[PDB]
Amino acid sequence: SAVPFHGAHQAGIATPVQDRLHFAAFDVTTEDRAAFVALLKEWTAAARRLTAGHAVGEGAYGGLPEAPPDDTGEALGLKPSRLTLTIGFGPSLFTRFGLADLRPEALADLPKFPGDNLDRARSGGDLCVQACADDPQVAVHAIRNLARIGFGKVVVRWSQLGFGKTSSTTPDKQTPRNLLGFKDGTRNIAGTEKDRLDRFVWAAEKDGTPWMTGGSYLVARRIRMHIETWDRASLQEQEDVFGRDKGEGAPVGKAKERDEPFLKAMKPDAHVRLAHPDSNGGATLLRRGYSFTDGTDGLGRLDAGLFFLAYQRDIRTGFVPVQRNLATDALNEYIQHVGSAVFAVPPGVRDADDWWGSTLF
Amino acid sequence: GSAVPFHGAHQAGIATPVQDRLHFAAFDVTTEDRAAFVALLKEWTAAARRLTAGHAVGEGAYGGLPEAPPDDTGEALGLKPSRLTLTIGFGPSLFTRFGLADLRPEALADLPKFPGDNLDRARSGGDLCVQACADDPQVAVHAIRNLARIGFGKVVVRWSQLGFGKTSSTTPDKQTPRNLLGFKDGTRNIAGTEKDRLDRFVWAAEKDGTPWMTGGSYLVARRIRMHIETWDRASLQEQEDVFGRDKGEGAPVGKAKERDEPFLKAMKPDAHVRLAHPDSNGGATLLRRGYSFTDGTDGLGRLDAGLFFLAYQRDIRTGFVPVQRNLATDALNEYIQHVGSAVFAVPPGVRDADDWWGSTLF
Ligand code: HEM
Ligand code: HEM
Numbered sequence: 105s106a107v108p109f110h111g112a113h114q115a116g117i118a119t120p121v122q123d124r125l126h127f128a129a130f131d132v133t134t135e136d137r138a139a140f141v142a143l144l145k146e147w148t149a150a151a152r153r154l155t156a157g158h159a160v161g162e163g164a165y166g167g168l169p170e171a172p173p174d175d176t177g178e179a180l181g182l183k184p185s186r187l188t189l190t191i192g193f194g195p196s197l198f199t200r201f202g203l204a205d206l207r208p209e210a211l212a213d214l215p216k217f218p219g220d221n222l223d224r225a226r227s228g229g230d231l232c233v234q235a236c237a238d239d240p241q242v243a244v245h246a247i248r249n250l251a252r253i254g255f256g257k258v259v260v261r262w263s264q265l266g267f268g269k270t271s272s273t274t275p276d277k278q279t280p281r282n283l284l285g286f287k288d289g290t291r292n293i294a295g296t297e298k299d300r301l302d303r304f305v306w307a308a309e310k311d312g313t314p315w316m317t318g319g320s321y322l323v324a325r326r327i328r329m330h331i332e333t334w335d336r337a338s339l340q341e342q343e344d345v346f347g348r349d350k351g352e353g354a355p356v357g358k359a360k361e362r363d364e365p366f367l368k369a370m371k372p373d374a375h376v377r378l379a380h381p382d383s384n385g386g387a388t389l390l391r392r393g394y395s396f397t398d399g400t401d402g403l404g405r406l407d408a409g410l411f412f413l414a415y416q417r418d419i420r421t422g423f424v425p426v427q428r429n430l431a432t433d434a435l436n437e438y439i440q441h442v443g444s445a446v447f448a449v450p451p452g453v454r455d456a457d458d459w460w461g462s463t464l465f
Numbered sequence: 466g467s468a469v470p471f472h473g474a475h476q477a478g479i480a481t482p483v484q485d486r487l488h489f490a491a492f493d494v495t496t497e498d499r500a501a502f503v504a505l506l507k508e509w510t511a512a513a514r515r516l517t518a519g520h521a522v523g524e525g526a527y528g529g530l531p532e533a534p535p536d537d538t539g540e541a542l543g544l545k546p547s548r549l550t551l552t553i554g555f556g557p558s559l560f561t562r563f564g565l566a567d568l569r570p571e572a573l574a575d576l577p578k579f580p581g582d583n584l585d586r587a588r589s590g591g592d593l594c595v596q597a598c599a600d601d602p603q604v605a606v607h608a609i610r611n612l613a614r615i616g617f618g619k620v621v622v623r624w625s626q627l628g629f630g631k632t633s634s635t636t637p638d639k640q641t642p643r644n645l646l647g648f649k650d651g652t653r654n655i656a657g658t659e660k661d662r663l664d665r666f667v668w669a670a671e672k673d674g675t676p677w678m679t680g681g682s683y684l685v686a687r688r689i690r691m692h693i694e695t696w697d698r699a700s701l702q703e704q705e706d707v708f709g710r711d712k713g714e715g716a717p718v719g720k721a722k723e724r725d726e727p728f729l730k731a732m733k734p735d736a737h738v739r740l741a742h743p744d745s746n747g748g749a750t751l752l753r754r755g756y757s758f759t760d761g762t763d764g765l766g767r768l769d770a771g772l773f774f775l776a777y778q779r780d781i782r783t784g785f786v787p788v789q790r791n792l793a794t795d796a797l798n799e800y801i802q803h804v805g806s807a808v809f810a811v812p813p814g815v816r817d818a819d820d821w822w823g824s825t826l827f
Pocket of ligand 2: 708
């Protein structure tokens with residue numbers, strides 16, 4: 105029903121993946137360090153209430169008639185819904201408050217990549233809040249109300265709703281399918297592998313930035329799918345793109361989805377073969393992305409795709425090498441990166457006295 | 466996760482209990498060949514039968530001819546029906562084609578201008594629509610996508626709307642949802658079991674004057690933006706005066722329970738419930754079935770939220786038109802703006818495995 109908010113790491117990275125996503129990036133409007141820290145403390149107090157399913161402050165109602173309610177109220181009567189709130193700090197934050205020398209070296213700016221068509225307005229951001237929950241209205245309410253508490257100190261830069269499986273009807277032991285119809289998530293880091301989390305995901309003290317110990321680095325890519333084109337490709341082109349069959353998700357030449365792949369039996373530019381850690385010196389990622397469908401553009405086409413999210417111990421040794429290796433991906437015919445951002449995700453809130461970003465400020 | 470039956474005297478997705486998710490699509494017809502269009506309708510009915518039962522369209526999502534693209538795009542494979550319903554409607558601009566002029570119902574009236582109307586002509590109108598409602602949004606998207614695929618060349622998508630969450634109720638025995646303004650929405654609606662209220666207020670009847678419409682309904686859709694910034698700085702008393710009900714329980718002003726009957730004269734003269742209530746509109750009654758939406762930011766540092774409002778009624782001229790006309794002085798107007806609009810005639814149900822969408826019209 106609820107995920108614990110306190111811990112060594114922030115929840116919502118290695119904790120079980122919830123049904124829905126509302127991702128928002130904020131820009132900071134204050135120059136005042138104190139004002140900003142005060143906001144971080146207020147945000148943490150509100151996150152505590154929200155993740156336990158209570159209203160922020162003095163509730164959505166029953167207060168002074170002459171005052172606006174503390175909480176906007178649209179979550180009353182709903183359950184915590186495994187809601188998690190994960191905050192991240194973007195590179196541009198460290199140009200404020202005199203933090204320029206505390207920017208972690210692992211929070212590297214992404215290269216320009218072949219094919220990039222990055223929409224400036226839907227990229228970047230001084231900080232982000234990732235709201236995950238099984239009920240989309242719980243997630244929205246959270247973002248809605250943090251934006252409200254921050255008004256005059258932050259604004260919403262861009263926002264993205266997303267969805268994965270629906271846990272009210274499908275088994276937790278069944279891989280969800282992306283909007284291209286293929287199983288997505290088969291060969292991923294799972295939250296149970298604390299050994300691979302420690303090696304590939306969490307910032308370690310001796311990494312170079314002590315305030316980030318227990319943190320992680322997040323890469324967000326908004327990836328449009330050319331759906332009508334994909335849907336016109338033969339079943340064989342589709343399976344050739346990935347190196348797995350569509351019905352079962354088995355690596356080509358194999359029988360069950362979870363059979364370990366034989367890379368030489370795949371086409372040289374098949375996605376799985378180019379993404380595999382064996383093709384990238386061991387580089388391994390934790391994918392935690394969500395599908396999106398926003399509507400339709402002015403040409404009739406479905407404005408849909410994958411809001412790709414990756415956690416990694418170092419952006420330099422995680423996302424950049426693998427993405428670089430996709431230069432020739434057969435899938436590139438069918439997708440387009442149109443938004444991008446990177447964030448440093450601080451360690452967890454240890455107890456009821458701690459706050460978001462305490463190690464940095 | 467059960468299925469909702471597709472056959473009936475009426476189309477599902479109207480009096481049916483309100484599912485969590487919506488994907489709504491308006492289509493324009495790009496063929497002039499009437500026989501082309503009827504075959505479309507027949508092929509779509511057959512896909513619909515599979516889709517509502519949790520089955521793949523045509524010959525399935527895989528295991529077909531390798532050189533050929535699959536019949537079903539496959540992103541619903543291994544998912545339950547999820548109470549998917551598919552409801553089709555014909556917009557007034559459709560009867561300009563195929564020699565249907567004299568068949569347009571009288572009850573499908575174009576809507577007049579309303580004060581404050583700021584209607585985007587792109588996200589308005591449509592030759593026909595499909596309302597897809599499901600508890601899983603992947604299921605709802607998959608249906609729309611596949612329907613539009615089957616219709617490549619005979620129809621294209623003029624505009625769509627996804628509702629991430631319901632703000633309506635047809636089952637008063639279950640909790641009333643809240644809209645993005647924080648109020649319960651749907652308390653005094655028409656319930657799917659109130660058959661006599663549905664017959665009186667929702668289903669078109671034979672003597673109404675358009676026979677092929679017997680058993681159908683008429684749909685009004687309004688895309689309504691909410692000025693949430695303005696709303697969120699209003700006092701709690703102001704928010705309660707706008708509606709006539711308190712925020713917490715959702716009870717009419719001065720009473721204690723959500724479902725106690727509102728006593729209209731204790732509400733402000735311009736309170737929403739006071740003005741929308743049937744007794745203020747000579748009995749006019751609507752079946753509300755709308756959904757919340759949010760379409761990113763506004764590029765001004767704020768979230769972009771609204772309500773995709775849908776009303777089914779027996780006659781547009783006696784349902785939505787008079788009630789919306791009485792809302793000219795509604796206190797709510799200060800916080801909302803109508804920015805999209807369309808009306809549709811929703812035909813009778815597909816009666817059996819041999820029938821098809823629109824058979825009574827064609
Ligand atoms: C629209 C965008 C994308 C789609 C539809 C897609 C799809 C898939 C599919 C179907 C699989 C096989 C099942 C699985 O293990 O998840 C896969 C695997 C994988 N993908 Fe992607 N992908 C996309 C973008 C990316 C990007 C941008 C990256 C990295 C920058 C990436 C990295 C990986 C990795 C590391 C694997 C696991 C490979 C293995 O170890 O077997 N993917 N992807
Ligand atoms: C953003 C726009 C709107 C919002 C937020 C909203 C909200 C509400 C709320 C909170 C109620 C009271 C609870 C209930 O009984 O359902 C209500 C009732 C009602 N509304 Fe609205 N509403 C909106 C637009 C409209 C429109 C456009 C119409 C008709 C054109 C309408 C017609 C009604 C009716 C008929 C009732 C039932 C009143 C009764 O008989 O007691 N509403 N609405």
